[model samples]
Target: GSSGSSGSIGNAQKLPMCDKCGTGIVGVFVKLRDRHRHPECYVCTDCGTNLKQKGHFFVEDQIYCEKHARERVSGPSSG
Candidate 1:
């Protein structure tokens, strides 16, 4: 009998499936530590622009572009 049956990263699948597109990609794709979003899916919720370029802003749970992410609310985490 086997001792353990725990899975590990040593045997990862060659193709990776995504939660955004619901498809498997074998070649390349985008990876984000911020809630995990695809390149196209990781755009500003306000304007039709990207946050990677120029700059990005996070207001609570809303994603905004640099142009529209001005003068917003701020939670005094340390202040």
Candidate 2:
């Protein structure tokens, strides 16, 4: 029988390391709990969070997060 793995994972199965913050992302899913994503989620080219929203928002690959992404869409400013 195969042994059950603990919550901890080895480097091999670990997610890709985010260059900006070094956070390991297993899959492309952002897992936005409240639909609120930080800037680093989309702006950082190295670790851009280009995931889709729950039918309300459909962010394209060119979209960026709040901190890192450029909010020049002539829409509401993130103030």
Candidate 3:
């Protein structure tokens, strides 16, 4: 016997969707460089590793983990 409350709760309340998955974030969402995400979804745009509370970089609205952040600045090396 489905109570019909399962889908209603999250949907009923107006909330921001995760920028990564496009699903509504019920709790513990991450806000990075003016974007919203689930805590687990707060990842680097390049390496796709979880950023969490670690150092990160945002360029042109894209978030990068620290390692990649440095690489992005250097970019591809020219011989």
Candidate 4:
């Protein structure tokens, strides 16, 4: 005979860590660049601005703010 208080499962599994901040995520999170990140951490790399539901630019395997993207395009490329 066995005694159990709850369901068959023992305890809930742990959540994945946020890729940007390296902390545990509680509320909303997102997947960026094949990595997990908290909502607040999913920001523009150039400006550190939040990209919540807003259009963003991805270039050279790095995320850039709109202003930075334009700047990069305007200037000459190194390679």
Candidate 5:
């Protein structure tokens, strides 16, 4: 249905679905110049799920996709 209960961005039939239930969007999780956000859209840097997560971006002031996002959590420390 268009209620945003289930389905991916490709499966979505409308705009502004639910984030919790995969409805509208996943929200913005970046720290770029705009801080872009979309309804039922997050563009997961790890799995491309479009799920919103608060403060998921923090490092050398760089924005990493889902895969690279995790890299900030591990490996050598940078100062």
Candidate 6:
């Protein structure tokens, strides 16, 4: 019983860590940053509001609410 297993995990579960909670995650999570975030913790960067990880837009570096996300790209702001 001394053969190296091709598949190995660095940690016990090799699960993704949550950036906000700073803990291992298993349930629903958002994948945007280098560190993943739990749905509860995953929210708009600017507003920090609950998004349910739902109908939200994604940027290169951060998650954004629909309102801000569109504006981020370019808002008409021309009423």
Top candidate by TM-score: 3
Error of 2 at 32 (Å): 21
* TM-score ranking, high to low: 3, 6, 4, 1, 5, 2
lDDT of each: 0.59, 0.42, 0.73, 0.70, 0.47, 0.71
Model 4 segments beyond 4 Å from truth?
A: 1-14
My TM-score estimates for the predictions, one after another, are: 0.47, 0.26, 0.66, 0.53, 0.28, 0.55
lDDT by residue for model 6 (1-79), tens: 9797489556585778876668888877776535578877787777888877455666655577888888876755443
Model 3 TM-score is 0.66
Candidate 5 stretches with Cα past 4 Å from truth are: 1-34, 53-55, 59-68, 76-79
Lowest lDDT 10-residue stretch of candidate 1: 70-79
Better of 1 and 6 by lDDT: 6
- Which candidate number has the best lDDT? 3
* Residue ranges of candidate 1 with Cα displaced over 4 Å: 1-30, 74-79
Q: For model 5, state the Cα shift of residue 40 in Å.
A: 3.9
**Which 10-residue window of candidate 4 scores lowest in summed lDDT?**
4-13
TM-score of candidate 5 to 2 decimals: 0.28
For candidate 6, report its TM-score: 0.55
lDDT (Cα, tens digit) per residue for candidate 4, span 1-79? 5675466766666876786568767767876666567777778777888777664566775665787877876788868
Q: Give the TM-score of candidate 1.
A: 0.47
Candidate number with the higher TM-score (1 or 4) = 4
Task: Give the Å error, residue 6, model 5.
Answer: 31
Question: Model 2 — TM-score against the truth?
Answer: 0.26
Each model's RMSD to truth, in Å? 9.8, 11.2, 5.1, 9.1, 10.1, 10.0
Query: Model 1 over residues 1-79: C-alpha lDDT tens digits?
Result: 9899587657667554553455555454545545444566456666658677765567765567767666454434423
- Which should have the higher lDDT, number 3 or number 4? 3
